[PDB]
Structures are given as structure tokens and as C-alpha cells.
């Protein structure tokens, strides 16, 4: 769509109405808009760096910067075809944001498929309040989940305790297993201890599933019977 002109110039078109006398009274917005000018450039802006990984955009490596031979054993003495194509479009295309943590996150849930079954809440509370010390995995305010492992792994690589990402990741994974085992026992024991003191529960999870399966299996029984009788009539033909 064409860059519109009349929406940002209401003050100037109004000013012509007032100066000529076509409009007798100044509108209430008139003074407010005059003191706060609208932005009216609507230009495309170049970008020279990917904010996620700091990669520089718009830099050409000259042959003088590649004095040594390549992986093929050949020296570079002249620009190649790619070097001779204008790359202005890359300056204007929104950069693809990438993060190393994304690679680890995919790995964690590939190794632990059932961690996906633990519901995650995407609704944020207040990102600015998060005061986390990733020297330890547990944190007050956030659940223990795959993200706890990833942030712990990054802290280890950031503090240079471990050099390889794999080693830091493995170290964090074991800390995660220990915390997961202590919680699986606290829940089992809590249920056992309550039943031993006379706690009663209406429906268990296993019972809930049986009831839901019965509701479905009852409708399925009717339809099967109905469709096993239309077939008999239709086939009789």
C-alpha cells in the first residue's frame, strides 16, 4: 500500500482551515499535536549486526585477508562470483535470531521425551523480577524443568568450570536427576503417610481414566451395533 500522507499531516491541513477562516475554533488536539510532532519518514533502515550472536552484517573479507591456502590446498588470488554480487538486501532483511541454548533444549527433550508431558506455563509473570543465582539448579520462583538444566549448563560454561559444552551439559543432567528423584520420593511417601493416618480419596488417577474410557466405550458400543445392522441389510441386497 502507498505511504499515506494525510494521516500524519492533520496538523498542517487543520492549520490551513484556521488561517483561512474555514474553521473558526482551534481543536483541542491542535496544541497537543503541534508540541509532539509525528514521525513521518517511513524509511527502511539498514542493520549491520545480528543482535543475538553479534555476527557482523555487511562485511566483505578481501583476498588480502585470506593469505593462507584453503581446505582444498589452493590460495585465493581473485574475488569469487559471490564476492562480486551486491549484498544490500542482507542489510535490510530482518536478521534470524539464533541461540546456542536452542540446540541444547532440543537435545534435552529428545533424550527425555516424557519431560514434554509435564505441563509448561508460557504466561510470564514479570521477567524483570527474576533474580537467579545459577550456581545451583533450584531457584525460588520457577519450576524445575529442562530449562533449569540449560541455564545451569550455560553458567558452567560461562564460569569456565568446564570447557566442552557436552561435559557441562552432562554435569547439569545428573544434578537434575538427583532433584527429580528426591521429588518422586516425597510424593510417593506423602501419599503413603496420609493413607496411614486415615486420609480418604474419592477418585484416583487410574479410576479417572477407567470412567472416561467407559463413557467412550459406551457410545462406541451403540454405533458398532447400529453399523453392524445397516451392513447386514445393505449386504442382503
Amino acid at each position: 500500500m502507498k505511504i499515506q500522507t494525510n494521516a500524519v499531516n492533520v496538523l498542517q491541513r487543520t492549520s490551513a482551515y484556521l488561517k483561512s477562516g474555514l474553521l473558526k475554533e482551534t481543536p483541542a488536539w491542535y496544541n497537543v499535536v503541534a508540541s509532539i510532532p509525528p514521525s513521518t519518514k517511513f524509511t527502511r533502515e539498514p542493520r549491520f549486526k545480528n543482535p543475538s550472536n553479534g555476527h557482523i552484517i555487511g562485511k566483505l573479507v578481501d583476498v588480502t585477508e585470506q593469505p593462507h591456502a584453503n581446505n582444498k590446498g589452493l590460495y585465493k588470488t581473485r574475488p569469487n562470483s559471490s564476492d562480486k554480487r551486491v549484498g544490500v538486501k542482507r542489510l535490510y532483511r530482518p536478521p534470524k535470531l539464533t541461540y546456542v541454548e536452542d540446540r541444547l533444549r532440543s537435545l534435552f527433550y529428545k533424550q527425555h521425551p516424557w519431560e514434554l508431558s509435564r505441563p509448561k506455563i508460557l504466561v510470564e509473570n514479570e521477567i524483570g523480577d527474576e533474580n537467579y543465582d545459577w550456581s545451583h539448579m533450584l531457584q525460588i520462583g520457577r519450576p524445575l524443568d529442562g530449562e533449569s538444566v540449560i541455564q545451569r549448563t550455560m553458567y558452567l560454561i560461562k564460569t569456565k568450570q568446564y570447557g566442552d559444552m557436552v561435559e557441562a551439559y552432562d554435569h547439569a543432567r545428573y544434578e537434575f536427576y538427583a532433584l527429580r528423584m528426591q521429588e518422586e520420593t516425597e510424593q510417593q511417601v506423602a501419599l503413603e503417610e496420609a493413607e496411614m493416618f486415615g486420609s480418604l480419596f474419592g477418585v484416583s488417577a487410574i479410576e479417572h481414566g477407567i470412567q472416561k474410557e467407559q463413557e467412550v466405550l459406551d457410545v462406541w458400543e451403540k454405533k458398532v451395533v447400529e453399523e453392524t445392522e445397516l451392513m447386514a441389510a445393505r449386504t442382503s441386497n
Partner: protein, 257 residues
């Protein structure tokens, strides 16, 4: 995040404890330490889940019927119960920190003493206190809670819980210790309760209970050991029931105005 509530006159509580019941060290254990311990564990259990936005009392009701959330229920029940106990044993609910008030003479109200006579066959408050001390010593072998509760029929009665047993929801009162032996009468009560829970049509298998606590006494080791010692929990319960804050206990009885 669940945080420990601020208590009125906290500077006095951290210096002279609760007069006639707990010392400064004893009160730091029961409230400043244990309440922090509970709230932190509750935050770790509930952070990242829908339960984080609910107050502990609402959490226990929501989780009362879920067997595998008992850990969350225990923490929520303990937190709510502990602040019910710390609230009625507190010198003054109003913050006389700048008023330096040292005259808080609270006595049972007329509505409370009228319901006591009606529900206890004319027994006096002093006699009922003796029954409460006896019930705690013979029904709670270990940790637990002592409550004076009111039901939907306007009758005050005494309920004791083992460990973290809620007074609000009878299926989770935990009033019978099944580790030891039970009489046929106790088994009948448990069997009758199970039948009531099975009559509910809700998919969550939950029943309606309108019981509400009036007095709460913490029978956990975090409240008495340091000041009374093993075996002296009956001297602790006697002091608590004799130095209750009746401005809070009277307000817990529904009047209807």
C-alpha cells in the same frame, strides 16, 4: 512466590517471644524459621503451576482430593494451620508498635460461652480445656494439630489431626492413626466416611464440608520442644489455651449482623 506474612509487633516478637507460651528462641523456630521453611518448599512445589497464584487455604481445598498432590496439600495445610495457631496466641493483632500498648485483656465472648454450654452438655470453658488437653495427649502420638471447630449445625466440637490434617475437609482430617490398632467403632466411622465420598457425583470425587476452625494449637515439635521438652507437651497446651487472644477467636464465630 509464597512469602511469610508479616506479623504485628514483630520487633517485640523477636525480642521477648510470646509471653507465657514461647520464648524468643521458641517463637523463631515455630514461625520465623518453620514458616520460612514451609513457604519456600511450597514455592518450589507450586512454582510454574497454576497453584502458584492461589493462597494456601485455597490450594489445600483444590488439592484435597488428589492423591498424588498430597505433598502440596501437606505443605499448604501446615502453612495455613501454623498462621491460625500463631494468630490466636498472639499478644495483640493490632500493631501497637507506636502506641506502646501493654494492656490487652481479652476474654471469651458471650456467644462463645453460650455455644460451649450448648454443645458440651453444660460444661464450662475450664472443663472443655481439660478435655482438649486430654484429647491431645491420647489421640496425637506424634506431630499433629488440636482444633476447636464449629460445624454447619452450630455445634462446637473438638477435632485432633495427625501431622498436617486440615479441619475444613473431613476426608483429610487425619484424625485416626491407622499405624496402631483401631476399634470397630473407629472402623465404622472410616467406612461411613468412605460411603459419603462415594455418593458424590462430581468427577473429582469431592464432598461438601462447612466445618471451620475457631482455635488452633500447634502440636508439632517445632513449637514446644525447645521451651518445654520431650514429654511436657501437655504443659504447653495448657499454657496456650490459657493465654489465647480472644479478639481473634471471637471474630471467628459467625454472628450474623
Amino acid at each position: 512466590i509464597h512469602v511469610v506474612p508479616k506479623l504485628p509487633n514483630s520487633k517485640a516478637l523477636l525480642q521477648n517471644g510470646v509471653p507465657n507460651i514461647l520464648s524468643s528462641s521458641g517463637f523463631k523456630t515455630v514461625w520465623f524459621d518453620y514458616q520460612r521453611y514451609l513457604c519456600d518448599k511450597l514455592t518450589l512445589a507450586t512454582a510454574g503451576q497454576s497453584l502458584e497464584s492461589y493462597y494456601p487455604f485455597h490450594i489445600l481445598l483444590k488439592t484435597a482430593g488428589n492423591p498424588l498432590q498430597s505433598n502440596i496439600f501437606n505443605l499448604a495445610s501446615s502453612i495455613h494451620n501454623n498462621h491460625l495457631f500463631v494468630e490466636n496466641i498472639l499478644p495483640s493483632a493490632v500493631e501497637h508498635g507506636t502506641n506502646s500498648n501493654a494492656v490487652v485483656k481479652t476474654e471469651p465472648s458471650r456467644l462463645f460461652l453460650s455455644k460451649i454450654k450448648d454443645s458440651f452438655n453444660g460444661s464450662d470453658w475450664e472443663v472443655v480445656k481439660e478435655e482438649m488437653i486430654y484429647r491431645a495427649e491420647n489421640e496425637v502420638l506424634g506431630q499433629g494439630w488440636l482444633f476447636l471447630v464449629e460445624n454447619n449445625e452450630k455445634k462446637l466440637f473438638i477435632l485432633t489431626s495427625n501431622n498436617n490434617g486440615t479441619p475444613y475437609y473431613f476426608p483429610r482430617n487425619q484424625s485416626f492413626d491407622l499405624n496402631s490398632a483401631i476399634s470397630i467403632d473407629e472402623f465404622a466411622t472410616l467406612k461411613q466416611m468412605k460411603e459419603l465420598i462415594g455418593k458424590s457425583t462430581k468427577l473429582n470425587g469431592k464432598v461438601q464440608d462447612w466445618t471451620m476452625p475457631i482455635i488452633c494449637v500447634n502440636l508439632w515439635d517445632h513449637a514446644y520442644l525447645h521451651d518445654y521438652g520431650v514429654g511436657n507437651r501437655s504443659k504447653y497446651v495448657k499454657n496456650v489455651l490459657d493465654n489465647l487472644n480472644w479478639s481473634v477467636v471471637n471474630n471467628r464465630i459467625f454472628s450474623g449482623i
